[PDB]
């Protein structure tokens, strides 16, 4: 009988892998672009004193295109408690829908499956995937993930593709910072209770809805805690050219006169967008 | 270098620092070239305990 203004909610988003992907904006819902397959060979080291030449072999230029997929939903009320409420469901629901759009879009753009969802780069499975060796312990051949791998992985990016960031669930980064050498000293941040370098300078954008190999942060691995070989760990790609995210129209909300039967006021919302994988040579995946 | 029984060949970091600074001094400046992967095979080297 002393109703407060407190609205403890206690729910989380992810980070967003959206400012990484190259952005493009389209008005029509069907765009088309060109691609250079290969320049091909032109001209050989011919001999001298040969009044002739060779036609070589011409290149190839493909012409691709891709759609934009839409995302819509509906939510209604009763119009009776909406008049006596000590709150505003509508402004809450409007926010409670955009939150569903932002998290569904980013997730789909990663793991979307073909039809009527942009094909994410995970399921596309054309990024070359690098899998790590297992280790020995008391004769057993448990799979593992040593700091030696992470440096080998990040550095093995072809230098001419450009500068490329890395993405991984923060529990992997927690796994890295806490490795110990033979004696017991830490590997990173020797003797300061915590290792936390400026990620931006080490080119590691961090997220929380990637496959997260350390299952709920409970599979470091010595016995039955092995990483369950075949799990995603981290990815690395020159994102501004490896993957594009298209945008057509931001979300809208429109009352639906008709269907509202004088009890149930029924709102409608939707938005249109899409994405597609560009040249999937810039980009690699690390795996257990 | 010897492994358990056999004689697998290898290439250690010590084998690189010994090659570069083994160039006849009176030849002028001398740089060196290598495939990117070879450079990424000296970065990720470990000593006895765990240290890079």
């Amino acid at each position: 009988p002393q109703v407060l203004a407190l609205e403890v909610d206690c729910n989380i988003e992810c980070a967003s892998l959206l400012d990484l992907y190259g952005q493009i904006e389209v008005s029509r819902s069907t765009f088309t672009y060109m691609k250079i397959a290969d320049y091909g060979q032109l001209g050989e080291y011919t001999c001298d004193a040969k009044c002739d030449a060779e036609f070589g072999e011409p290149g190839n230029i493909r012409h691709l295109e891709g759609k934009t997929y839409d995302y819509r939903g509906v939510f209604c009320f009763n119009r009776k408690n909406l008049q006596e409420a000590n709150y505003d469901f509508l402004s809450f629901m409007i926010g409670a829908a955009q939150r569903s759009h932002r998290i569904n879009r980013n997730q789909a753009l990663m793991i979307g499956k073909g039809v009527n969802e942009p094909k994410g780069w995970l399921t596309e499975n054309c990024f070359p995937v690098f899998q790590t060796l297992p280790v020995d312990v008391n004769g057993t051949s448990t799979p593992a993930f040593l700091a030696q791998d992470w440096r080998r992985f990040v550095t093995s990016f072809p230098a001419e593709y450009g500068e490329a960031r890395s993405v991984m669930h923060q529990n992997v980064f927690g796994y890295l910072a806490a490795m110990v050498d033979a004696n017991g000293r830490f590997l990173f941040g020797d003797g300061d209770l915590t290792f936390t370098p400026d990620l931006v300078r080490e080119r590691i954008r961090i997220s929380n809805c990637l496959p997260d190999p350390t299952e709920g942060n409970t599979k470091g691995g010595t016995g039955q805690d092995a990483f369950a070989a075949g799990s995603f760990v981290a990815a690395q790609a020159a994102w501004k050219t490896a993957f594009y995210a298209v945008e057509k129209r931001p979300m809208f909300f429109e009352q639906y006169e008709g269907g509202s039967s004088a009890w149930c006021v029924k709102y409608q919302f939707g938005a249109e967008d899409g994405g597609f994988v560009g040249c999937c040579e810039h980009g690699r995946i690390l795996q257990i | 270098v010897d492994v358990n029984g056999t004689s697998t060949p290898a290439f250690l970091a010590q084998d690189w620092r010994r090659f570069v600074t083994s160039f006849p001094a009176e030849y002028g400046e001398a740089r060196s070239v290598m495939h990117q992967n070879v450079f990424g095979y000296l970065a990720a080297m470990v000593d006895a305990n765990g240290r890079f």
Partner: peptide, 20 residues
């Protein structure tokens, strides 16, 4: 929530020489 374990990486060093 049930008490979850906090398994951290052990002393991991080697990948090419088993001990005697």
């Amino acid at each position: 929530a049930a008490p979850s374990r906090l398994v951290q990486p052990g002393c991991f060093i080697c990948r090419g020489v088993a001990v005697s």
